[PDB]
From Swiss-Prot:
Disorder: Osteopetrosis, autosomal recessive 3: A rare genetic disease characterized by abnormally dense bone, due to defective resorption of immature bone. Osteopetrosis occurs in two forms: a severe autosomal recessive form occurring in utero, infancy, or childhood, and a benign autosomal dominant form occurring in adolescence or adulthood. Recessive osteopetrosis commonly manifests in early infancy with macrocephaly, feeding difficulties, evolving blindness and deafness, bone marrow failure, severe anemia, and hepatosplenomegaly.
SMART domains the record matches: Carb_anhydrase
Consequence of substituting N59A: Reduced activity
Alphabetized UniProt keyword annotations: Acetylation, Cell membrane, Cytoplasm, Disease variant, Lyase, Membrane, Metal-binding, Osteopetrosis, Phosphoprotein, Zinc
Originating organism: Homo sapiens (Human)
Feature type site, description Involved in the binding of some activators, including histamine and L-histidine: Q89
Purpose: Catalyzes the reversible hydration of carbon dioxide. Can also hydrate cyanamide to urea. Stimulates the chloride-bicarbonate exchange activity of SLC26A6. Essential for bone resorption and osteoclast differentiation. Involved in the regulation of fluid secretion into the anterior chamber of the eye. Contributes to intracellular pH regulation in the duodenal upper villous epithelium during proton-coupled peptide absorption.
UniProt protein name: Carbonic anhydrase 2
The record's free-text note on cofactor binding: Zinc. Can also use cobalt(II) with lower efficiency, but not copper(II), nickel(II) and manganese(II).
Subcellular location: Cytoplasm; Cell membrane
Gene from which the chain derives: CA2
Length: 257
């Protein structure tokens, strides 16, 4: 089964998910000098006031916080998007050290981690149907650098000891994802894919320019998670990021000058 190890990592994924060598794979390097400012791009609309978080889960490749997506409660609209996208879950990708961990890079710069808020287009009714559509998902990507703590992240970090190993989950209600957002909603956008299997080419990527700062203590708690299930040889959940993929016939657009 797929993972991030020597023998099952991103370089192996194409064997089970041949779309890994496709025409709109993610992540990519964002060359800031080649991204073109698009004045037609609308401001992003992030409406998270009524978000209902449900559970936090270790799925063996990341940890994710899941939300109630049975109603327009936490929605993403505007920006490059047509229509309304419901927040399904967020999760992170991080490194073994602070110089790696993000999936997207900015002028080849890797960040310590990358937060992905995954949303699906309500015109497709459910996420499984949306993953089959070229405009089915919108993932909001936010870079994490190490410095000052992010207070809005602390409730996440403090529960990770209860989901150390693959398959553990816990109630995680009343978490407000607005506490994970940077000040600016300036973004880059491009058509891409899921960055984990099945690597489906269904994502409008919206990557924020402004990183959030998290503390070394906060990221160290990410790195104490395990890829393995309980009772298995302990393999620390670190470096769960896919490297940048060929841009091919794609243009990255910037919402800002
Ligand atoms: C689509 C069903 C649930 C889901 O969210 N699957 C994802 N697979 N990769 C994602 S990423 N790293 O691009 O945000 S999300
Ligand atoms: C537009 C949604 C679907 C998509 O974009 N891509 C894929 N269709 N089959 C794939 S496999 N077996 O490689 O994972 S991927
Ligand atoms: Zn992700």
């Amino acid at each position: 089964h797929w993972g991030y190890g020597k023998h099952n990592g991103p370089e192996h994924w194409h064997k089970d998910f041949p779309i890994a060598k496709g025409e709109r794979q993610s992540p990519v390097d964002i060359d800031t000098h080649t991204a073109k400012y698009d004045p037609s791009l609308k401001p992003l609309s992030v409406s998270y006031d009524q978000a209902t978080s449900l559970r936090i889960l270790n799925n063996g490749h990341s940890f994710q916080v899941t939300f109630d997506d049975s109603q327009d409660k936490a929605v993403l609209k505007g920006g490059p998007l047509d229509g309304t996208y419901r927040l399904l879950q967020f999760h992170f990708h991080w490194g073994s050290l602070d110089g790696q961990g993000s999936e997207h890079t900015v002028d080849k710069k890797k960040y310590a981690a990358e937060l992905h808020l995954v949303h699906w287009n309500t015109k497709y009714g459910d996420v499984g149907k949306a993953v089959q559509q070229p405009d089915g998902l919108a993932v909001l990507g936010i870079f994490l650098k190490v410095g000052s703590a992010k207070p809005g992240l602390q409730k996440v970090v403090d529960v990770l000891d209860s989901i150390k190993t693959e398959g553990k989950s816990a109630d995680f209600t009343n978490f407000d994802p607005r506490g994970l957002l940077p000040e600016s909603l300036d973004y880059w956008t491009y058509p891409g894919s899921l960055t984990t299997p099945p690597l489906a080419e269904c994502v409008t990527w919206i990557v924020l320019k402004e990183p959030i700062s998290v503390s070394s203590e906060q990221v160290l708690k990410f790195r104490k998670l395990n890829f393995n299930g309980e009772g298995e040889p302990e393999e620390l959940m670190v470096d769960n990021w896919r490297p940048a993929q060929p841009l091919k016939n794609r243009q990255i657009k910037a919402s800002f000058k």
